[PDB]
């Protein structure tokens, strides 16, 4: 029982890591994009 | 008589262990899943 | 008797897991939404 | 009993989410308004 | 005699279960309500 | 006897819930007020 | 007993709120005063 | 004899309840007072 | 016997409350003093 | 009997330690990775 | 008879103490190791 | 016993307060010194 | 016989109270010392 | 017997206090060192 | 048993301190390097 329990728990943890990574990638890309747009547009002009 | 009594008692104990293990596996999986979901969703955002 | 008792207990546990999951999903969605709204509105402005 | 308990708890949580959202909307609107007023008035002059 | 005794005992147990369930429902609703109020009011502000 | 005992216990629990709710309302109002005063006075100046 | 206990607890909480409010008023007045002095003296000169 | 025995036992129990209630009221007041003092003094400063 | 026992217990509890209050007063004064020193010295400079 | 019982218990404990270590290694690696990604991407830009 | 009985009982108790000490040493080492790993890895990063 | 225990605890707390105060005084002096050196050297030049 | 028996029992109880008080004083002093050291060293730095 | 038992227990407790103090001293020194290194290196640069 | 347990625990703690120190040294070197590069390149040009 411990075998299956721990294996399923690890698999679920890995999937959750995957979804979390996708979401943080999206969020971080958006925030760095807005910051870079602000900085470049402000300084270059 | 003692032979059959003790053997039946041990078999019943083993089955009860089996059902208990199944139920705790389900419960522990659920609670660890909810805790991991909370932690990952909170920190990653 | 043990069969029916354990089966009913497991079924009730599964239903309780379901309701708990629904409620935590709602709560976590709300809290992450408010936090994301605050962060994006504050930084983007 | 679990049905009614969980349903009432979810409904109360939803209402609390509603009031919290209204209050944070007001607070965030006020703070972004004051910050934008300061920034625009300072730079434009 | 055993019939009536056990039936009455089971009925009394069922009624006691009913009153206990009502009281715990009230208590749990109150405590979760106060905790949720504290959490939402603290974080949203 | 169980009728009266459980009814009185539930009534006492309800009254205690009432006093607890009043006190937490006062405490939470005070703490959110001080926090909001600090935040608004600090940022607006 | 619950009457007197809760009433005394609420009264003590109210007094503590009073002292806390006085102290934060003093502290916030001092910090805003120093910040305003710095800002006005620096910019006006 | 049972009349007097049970009546005296109930009276003694009631008095013991009274002394216990007084002592717990004192103890609970003290502990909540110290906790509230710590919380308010820490946060308000 | 109950009279003397409860009275002595209450007196001992009161003395313990006194020593605890003295110690927490000292500790809280020290910690708030260090925090205020840090804050004022950092901001004023 | 004590020999075999304690030896089996220690072996099972060791295996459980192994699975727990694997899972925490995965979880800690993921969380430190996301935190480091956030920090480096935010500061370097 | 009492001599041999008590001596054997004490010897068995001593051996059981030995096995228990070994097992708790292993368990405590594992749990403190995982906690220290978590703390150091989280803070140092 | 409570007398000596509380007195020794208060004395140890007072000594710890003393060492902590000495160390924070040193640290705060150093950090304010470096900040003031940076500010004065940068602006005066 | 009851005189001597009860007197000896009370004396033995008093001595046991003495040793227990000494040991708890030592243990409590140690644990409060370590906790205070951790708290002061962490916050003051 | 109580004499020797309590004396040995107190001695063992004292030794355990010693080892615990050594270990916490090491751990606290390490953590304060890393925190101070981070703070000084970050601010001074 | 306590001897070996505490000695092994201290040794493991020391090794963990070593790895943590190496990693923070690398991280801090990198972050200070990037900050210094940015500052010098921006100002000198």
Numbering used by the authors:
A (entry chain A), B (entry chain A), C (entry chain A), D (entry chain A), E (entry chain A), F (entry chain A), ...: 6 to 50
Article sentences:
Using helical reconstruction and applying C5 symmetry, a 3.2 Å-resolution map of the fd phage capsid was obtained, which allowed derivation of an atomic model of the capsid. In agreement with previous predictions, the atomic model reveals a pentameric (C5) subunit arrangement of the pVIII capsid protein, which forms a single α-helix containing 50 residues. The helix is terminated at the N-terminus of the mature protein by a proline residue (P6), and residues 1–5 of the capsid protein, which are located on the phage surface, are disordered. Due to helical symmetry, capsid protein monomers stack almost vertically to form a highly symmetrical arrangement along the helical axis. The C-terminus of the capsid protein, which faces the inner lumen of the cylindrical phage, interacting with the genomic DNA, has four positively charged lysine residues exposed to the lumen. These lysines presumably bind to the negatively-charged DNA phosphates, as also seen in other phages. While density for the DNA is observed in our fd cryo-EM map, it is not well-resolved and does not support atomic model building of the DNA genome. Our structure suggests that while Y21 is involved in hydrophobic interactions within the capsid, it does not act as a structural hinge, evidenced by our high-resolution map. Structural comparison with Pf44, a class II inoviral bacteriophage with a prophage lifestyle, shows a slightly larger capsid size (fd: 50 residues, Pf4: 46 residues) and lumen diameter (fd: 24 Å, Pf4: 22 Å). In agreement with previous work, our structural model for fd suggests a circular single-stranded arrangement, as the higher positive charge-density of the capsid protein (four basic residues in fd versus two in Pf4) suggests that twice as many negative charges of the DNA phosphate backbone are being stabilised.
Inoviruses are filamentous phages infecting numerous prokaryotic phyla. The first inovirus identified, named fd, was reported in 1963 as a DNA-containing phage with an unusual filamentous morphology infecting Escherichia coli. Fd has since become a model for filamentous phage structure, infection, and assembly, as well as having found use in numerous biotechnological applications, including the first described instance of phage display, and as a model for examining colloidal-rod phase transitions. A unique property of inoviral phages, including fd and Pf4, is that they can spontaneously and reversibly self-assemble to form ordered but dynamic structures termed tactoids under crowding conditions.
